[PDB]
Amino acid sequence: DSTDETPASYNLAVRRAAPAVVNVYNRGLNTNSHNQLEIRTLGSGVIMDQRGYIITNKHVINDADQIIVALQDGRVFEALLVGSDSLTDLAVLKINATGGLPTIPINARRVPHIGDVVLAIGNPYNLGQTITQGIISATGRIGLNPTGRQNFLQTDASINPGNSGGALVNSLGELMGINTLSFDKSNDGETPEGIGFAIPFQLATKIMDKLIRDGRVIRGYIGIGGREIVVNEVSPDGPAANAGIQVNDLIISVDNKPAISALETMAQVAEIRPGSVIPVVVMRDDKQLTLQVTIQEYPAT
């Protein structure tokens, strides 16, 4: 009846990770504003390292006249946009590192498993830093839109406007992903509950590193739209069009490698340097042609 007992809590994870999560404010001038800054959009962000590099969603900082970053300790900074990527919806920011900066716990060897308890840290409706608890519902999700599929962590930890760019961590405080999207589509006009998506941490890291080194993310472009693999379409003046590639041809192997899954192959296509040459096997009228083509970098978006 009396308690020296310890209540079940995830405070440990909170104390470890929360300080690294910051409030991100996208300030824009308005024709209305008449020279006064107003909040276009607000969200969250994660301090990745001591240098002051911060991850956040791109849609949070788009078309921002000024970007303000607020720490939980009260410190406020004017953020500097290092770079952004529309494809992953990621953006990196830089701030003054004078004095101590909290960093989000990161474990590269850690493997996120379905059923793991996770906490979502962010600033919903600008109420202040909010912590919601859930689990990892699924991994490798393509998101709301099938087209242009990209990996996602699905969690039932409550996610709302302002949570974007914020952190998703486990009970140990380790970063699991960056909260990005919430499912809104309704089959019967009902409201979807407990379905939110986050960019896996490993991917976030790789994209950050690339954005820190270069102003942008660089990928290989081949100018082809297809389905598991035939060529559904050919981009005008594309590397494919330049190679004289023709629509309606199946593709067996590319870069001395098999091509059963378009997703795997396209990912591999983006890894290589722009301008490089590589073999491509295609079967037209049952002929194993081997056209040679020069790659170009992915068109800016």
UniProtKB/Swiss-Prot annotation:
Please provide the record's keywords in A-Z order. Answer: Cell inner membrane, Cell membrane, Hydrolase, Membrane, Protease, Serine protease, Transmembrane, Transmembrane helix
Q: What is annotated as the active site?
A: H59 (charge relay system), D89 (charge relay system), S164 (charge relay system)
Q: What is this protein called?
A: Serine endoprotease DegS
Q: Which GO terms describe its molecular function?
A: identical protein binding; peptidase activity; serine-type endopeptidase activity; serine-type peptidase activity
The residues listed in the UniProt record as binding substrate, with positions renumbered to this chain, are T147, I222, G223, I224, G225, G226, R227, Y298
What NCBIfam families does this protein's entry cite? PRK10898.1, protease_degS
- Mention one GO biological process in which this protein takes part, according to its record: cellular response to misfolded protein
Instruction: Give additional notes from the record.
Output: Regulated intramembrane proteolysis (RIP) occurs when an extracytoplasmic signal triggers a concerted proteolytic cascade to transmit information and elicit cellular responses. A membrane-spanning regulatory substrate protein is first cut extracytoplasmically (site-1 protease, S1P, this enzyme), then within the membrane itself (site-2 protease, S2P), while cytoplasmic proteases finish degrading the regulatory protein, liberating the effector protein.
User: Has UniProt tagged this entry with the keyword NADP?
Assistant: no
Has the keyword Transmembrane been applied to this entry? yes
* Primary location group: membrane
The reaction(s) catalysed by this protein are: Acts on substrates that are at least partially unfolded. The cleavage site P1 residue is normally between a pair of hydrophobic residues, such as Val-|-Val
- Entry's family note: Belongs to the peptidase S1C family.
Spell out which residues lie on the membrane's Periplasmic side.
Answer: 1-301
Q: What does this protein do?
A: A site-1 protease (S1P) that cleaves the peptide bond between 'Val-148' and 'Ser-149' in RseA. Part of a regulated intramembrane proteolysis (RIP) cascade. When heat shock or other environmental stresses disrupt protein folding in the periplasm, DegS senses the accumulation of unassembled outer membrane porins (OMP) and then initiates RseA (anti sigma-E factor) degradation by cleaving its periplasmic domain, making it a substrate for subsequent cleavage by RseP.
Q: Where in the cell is it found?
A: Cell inner membrane
- InterPro entries per the record? PDZ, PDZ_sf, Pept_S1C_DegS, Peptidase_S1_PA, Peptidase_S1_PA_chymotrypsin, Peptidase_S1C
